[PDB]
Amino acid sequence: GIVEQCCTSICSLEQLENYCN
Amino acid sequence: GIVEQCCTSICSLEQLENYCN
Amino acid sequence: GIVEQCCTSICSLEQLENYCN
Amino acid sequence: FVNQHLCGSHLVEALYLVCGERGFHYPK
């Protein structure tokens, strides 16, 4: 999940952008 | 639900006000 | 839960601080 | 007054602004 990618690992802007409306 | 009223449809201020404390 | 302590009762700063990362 | 759908975080922003110092509960 996004929680996993970004808290356990380091995520990129693009990975965050996938959650924008 | 409020998610439904306001994302699927257009909700009014009064509909939003029902969720204020 | 923190919701309980702090909405039903009055909680202290220290109680809130326990939820900080 | 509202002319937009309020999806995801937009609904939370709307409630924050509408409810002011009262605060709000969401999504229930």
Add this chain to the structure above:
Amino acid sequence: FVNQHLCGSHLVEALYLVCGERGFHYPK
């Protein structure tokens, strides 16, 4: 110091302010 009940979004605002740059987890 706290003299109010902190219900709904008010608890989240409190945690945001108390925890500062540390951030927080909620409601668990």
Add this chain to the structure above:
Amino acid sequence: FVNQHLCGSHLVEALYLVCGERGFHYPK
């Protein structure tokens, strides 16, 4: 660009900032 883990509220702050006026959905 991202050099930090984004845990708890920090991830929500990041999405708020990244997504701008689009808004976002979270955690799903």
